Amino acid sequence: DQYYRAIKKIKEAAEASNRAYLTSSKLADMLGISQQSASRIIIDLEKNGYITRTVTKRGQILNITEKGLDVLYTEFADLSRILAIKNNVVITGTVTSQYIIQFQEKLGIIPYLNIKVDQASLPELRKIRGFRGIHIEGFKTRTFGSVKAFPAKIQNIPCFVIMPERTVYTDVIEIISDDRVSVEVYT
Amino acid sequence: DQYYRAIKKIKEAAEASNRAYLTSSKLADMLGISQQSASRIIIDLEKNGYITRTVTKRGQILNITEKGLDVLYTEFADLSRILAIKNNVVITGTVTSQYIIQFQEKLGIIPYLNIKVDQASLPELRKIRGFRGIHIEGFKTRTFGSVKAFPAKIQNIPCFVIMPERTVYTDVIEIISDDRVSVEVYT
């Protein structure tokens, strides 16, 4: 939260980009906290992968990472769910080169593809990643993570986008079902 | 923020409605804070109009108010702006029975209507209210508040929805320009 707020203010200052010239003093002022609080937050955010910090001749740059953006997209998706705001998505890209029983029971399908999404659809993919989708339970064997399943359509044929719950930041999505491509994804 | 989080958790617990059975103990648990912290937050939120608290034979009910919802819609609109997510709106209702120089300069129009929006479009109106719109500066004469102006269209004719920046919770909107009705509103 004070962390959410710091990430949000940094992205806000980054304006259209994902980079901002910010000192701990300036960020402290934007946030209404002490310089020391701000310094500590920046260190924590950087050590834990939400931002990177780069010292240049022109000043210090705070860059939000894929993980830092995921914090904002997850909050957006939480509020969409809670306020019942519909935020379904289209992503385009290129086709590229225990769970099963749940796919059957929860998605009511018999499991049998890989898609490299375009850089220009990366913001839409990031949006999707913030949502919860259909929960598919992880388990112990090694502990296997839960996955998220998003009902989707390719050429009006239904399928699901499958993702680890512990988000991995990649431009490659996996689709399970019962060349350029367009996928509508239902959040 | 700890306040944002408490409002958000309360609305989340309210599920589809705007009411939740919650004790300070239960809310403390949901929030990861002490019972005493939770008690203090509930009191503050209630005294300041974000929630109401009602003691019944069935338990304590925390109800989110129009103002409490505005906190969530404002956060949603902040994230839409910051992440460049488009959230334009249609609202329907019924037609019902110093600033000027800025309307001219900022909206590039010559100012010359009132609409009672339907209960079913109230969620869309609430969404609009979270956005900033075009800023029209307040001033001193009495201090007059700033207003927000949202480009809009009725029957494909452009106009603006005008609102005080200090949100007022009403189902009546005012439109300025150069029976049932449908208004598209651009956030």
Swiss-Prot record, chains A, B:
Catalytic activity from the UniProt record: riboflavin + CTP = CDP + FMN + H(+)
Binding site for FMN: 167, 174
Segments for region (H-T-H motif-like): 1-88
Gene Ontology biological-process annotations: FMN biosynthetic process; regulation of DNA-templated transcription; riboflavin biosynthetic process
Listed Gene3D superfamilies: Riboflavin kinase-like, Winged helix-like DNA-binding domain superfamily/Winged helix DNA-binding domain
Keyword list, A-Z: Flavoprotein, FMN, Kinase, Magnesium, Metal-binding, Nucleotide-binding, Transferase
Enzyme Commission (EC) number: 2.7.1.161
Keyword Membrane: no
Protein name, entry field: Riboflavin kinase
Gene name per UniProt: ribK
